[PDB]
Structure formats: structure tokens, C-alpha cells
Write a protein that binds this ligand. Structure first.
Ligand SMILES: O=C(Cc1ccc(F)cc1)Nc1nc(-c2ccccn2)cs1
Ligand SMILES: O=C(Cc1ccc(F)cc1)Nc1nc(-c2ccccn2)cs1
Lengths: 193, 193
């Protein structure tokens, strides 16, 4: 039953690694999942709903990993704290590059995908800002920019930079360098001046 | 003659301020430009070619303004130097928000638009890196990250952040705050540690 749903999702993630969603048909998803096309439409109204489901799984995986980190701080310096947090997104989305790239593109076309991404970005930015505010309250970071505006720009940088690296866009930071690059910019802008 | 081309371009820029390119027809562009549909196809093969032309004008305007700045340095501190450069893009693209937003979306669909954007981003990143390298050579900036990788991430941040602000996305930095926000992150990451 729901097994067939997971088969549809797995087939979609596999096919997205080699072609965009526009080049994938409902019949391709049904055929790969071992079901008929009418049976597919029982589980999903469209191939776009399949992508939205895949993206929802990935963003919730990242959100849950960040929540785990937040509840069990690693005893390290400040640079390591930020690196471990940025790494949650590097590893989670980097493990699902086809879904990430496809979900990014679908933001222009799908209001559901745009709303899903916006909801989680607001959550992650609020958490970033709250940690920056905590660092300021304890005297470790200077009161420079409004924390929420700083957090917004830094999170948007990570979105654009990580996704460019994963897609091998030109220009991009090589994926083997992108964590160090982002961590440097976060740490200097949060603690600097 | 070429006057009718400029009328097509002006009509397209005006219509894009109120609806996306998918909701604009070749007939809408012809009607607004005072020409017939066959006459339009003399000047442009498609409405997508009109957008590519509009975007080419905007990116070359920004590139030429940056070249002007590079040849006449303003006598100021380092923070003002970076602010004046970032402002070139804030003002140029912020004066053509509909074209910017439409060109951003067309990157997913149009290889010509993606290549145009990539060509100019590589140019602007190379210039950023060369200035960072100059600052390091004169002892003003520390040798931290590879300059070209730092320049890449900072330019990608500006792309994503400026365009989110112009479109009023949620989340975004308010447009009245985005220049200060970006300048802070550039200056601390270039001169910090
Ligand atoms: O970077 C993002 C958001 C993102 C990344 C990649 C995307 F593709 C889309 C969104 N969120 C982050 N939060 C932290 C953080 C905050 C507080 C304490 C520790 N770590 C580090 S990175
Ligand atoms: O920020 C960008 C690229 C960009 C911005 C907005 C976009 F929408 C798309 C690309 N380029 C910049 N170069 C400088 C600079 C470099 C050296 C000296 C002085 N200024 C400042 S900002």
C-alpha cells in the first residue's frame, strides 16, 4: 500500500538524477514503481506533487538534524559550532542533489514548493538570529548589524552557494571547499569589528 | 526601423512589471509596440529573445558602470570603496526589477540566459578577487581564504540577497537595509581575522 508510495518516491528520486522533471512522465514513474498509471494517480495527483513530497522529506530531514544539534551542543570553539550547523545542510542536501536542484527550479513554477521553502528558511533564519543574539548577550559577539538581517543574508548566501556547488554551476565554489568558505564568512561577519 | 525594436523592448519591460513572461504573448508585444505580429518576428524570433535582449542591456549597463568605477577610484576608506561597488549592482538592477526577476526565472529554461549570466558573474568575481588580492599585496587584508573562492561566495550572496530584496520574497532583507547588510559581510570577511 504505502509501500507503493515509497516506490513512486524512490523511482522519482532515481530518475531526477539523470533528467529534469519536465523530461519525466507520469508513465515513467508508474513503470518504475511497478504500478499502472491509474494506480499512480491514487497516490499522487501529479508528478509535481511527487517532487513536493520528496522535497518535504529532505527539508524535514535537515530541520530535524538541526533540532538534534540544538539540543545537544558539541563542546567546541565558536567556529566549530557554526561549522557543525552549516554541515547539517551541506550533508543533508548534498546527499539529495537531484531533489535539491529539482526543488529549486520548481520554486519558480510551484507555489506549494515556494511556500515550503519559505517556511523552512524563515525557521532557520530565526534560529540563526537567536544564536547570534545569544552570543551578543554573553559578550562574545559585537552588536553590529541587526541580528535578523545578518542572519537572513548569511542563510541566503548558503542557499545560493551550496546549490551552485552541488550543481557544478559556473561560477561556483568547488564542493570540497564550500564548507570552509561559508564558515569563514559566517564567523568573521558574526564576530568581526 | 531600429526605433520599432526599441518600442518592442520598452513594451516588454513595461508589461513585465505587471505579469510574468509566460502571461505575455507575442501579440501583446506587437500591439504595445504599434506593429503587426509578422513585423515583430522580423526583429525578434520569440518573446524569449526579447527578454534576453533586455537582460543583456541591463547586465552591460552594470558592467560598464563597474568599469567606470574601476578607472576612477573614489578617495575614501576601504568600507566606502566596497559600498560604492556593491551600489552599482543595487542601483542598476534595482532600476530594472521586472527585467531582473524575469531574467532570473529564465535561467532555468533558457541556456542563452544562463550563459549570459554566467559570463558576467565570472567577470565580476574575477574583478572582486583581483581587488582582494591587491589589498592583500599592500598589507591591508590578511591572507585567509583563497581570494577567488571568497569572491565567489560573496558575489553569490549579493545575487541571491539583492534579488530576494527586490522581489520582496519572504525571507528577505528590506531593500532599505540590504546595502548596509552586504557591505558589513564583505568588509568583515575580507579584512577580518
Ligand atoms: O544555512 C542555513 C540555511 C540553509 C542552508 C542551506 C540551504 F540549502 C538552505 C538553507 N542554516 C544554518 N544554521 C546554522 C546554525 C545556526 C545556529 C547555530 C548553529 N548553526 C548554521 S547554517
Ligand atoms: O556583487 C557583485 C556581483 C553581482 C551583484 C548583484 C547581482 F545581481 C549579480 C552579481 N559584484 C561586486 N563587485 C564589487 C567590487 C569589486 C571590487 C572593487 C569594488 N567593488 C562590489 S560588488
Amino acid at each position: 500500500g504505502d509501500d507503493r508510495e515509497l516506490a513512486i518516491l524512490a523511482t522519482a528520486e532515481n530518475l531526477l538524477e539523470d533528467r529534469p522533471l519536465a523530461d519525466i512522465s507520469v508513465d515513467d514513474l508508474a513503470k518504475g514503481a511497478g504500478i499502472s498509471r491509474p494506480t499512480f494517480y491514487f497516490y499522487f495527483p501529479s508528478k509535481e506533487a511527487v517532487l513536493l513530497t520528496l522535497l518535504d522529506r529532505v527539508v524535514n530531514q535537515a530541520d530535524m538534524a538541526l533540532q538534534t544539534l540544538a539540543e545537544n551542543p558539541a563542546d567546541t570553539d565558536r567556529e566549530n559550532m557554526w561549522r557543525t550547523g552549516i554541515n547539517v545542510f551541506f550533508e543533508t542536501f548534498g546527499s539529495h542533489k537531484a531533489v535539491t536542484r529539482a526543488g529549486q527550479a520548481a520554486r519558480a513554477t510551484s507555489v506549494e514548493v515556494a511556500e515550503l521553502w519559505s517556511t523552512f528558511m524563515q525557521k532557520w533564519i530565526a534560529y540563526t538570529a537567536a544564536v547570534i543574539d545569544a552570543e551578543r548577550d554573553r559578550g562574545a559577539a559585537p552588536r553590529t548589524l541587526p541580528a535578523h538581517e545578518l542572519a537572513t543574508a548569511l542563510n541566503l548566501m548558503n542557499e545560493r552557494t551550496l546549490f551552485a556547488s552541488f550543481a557544478g554551476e559556473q561560477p561556483s565554489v568547488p564542493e570540497a571547499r564550500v564548507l570552509d568558505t561559508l564558515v569563514h564568512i559566517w564567523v568573521t561577519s558574526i564576530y568581526g569589528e
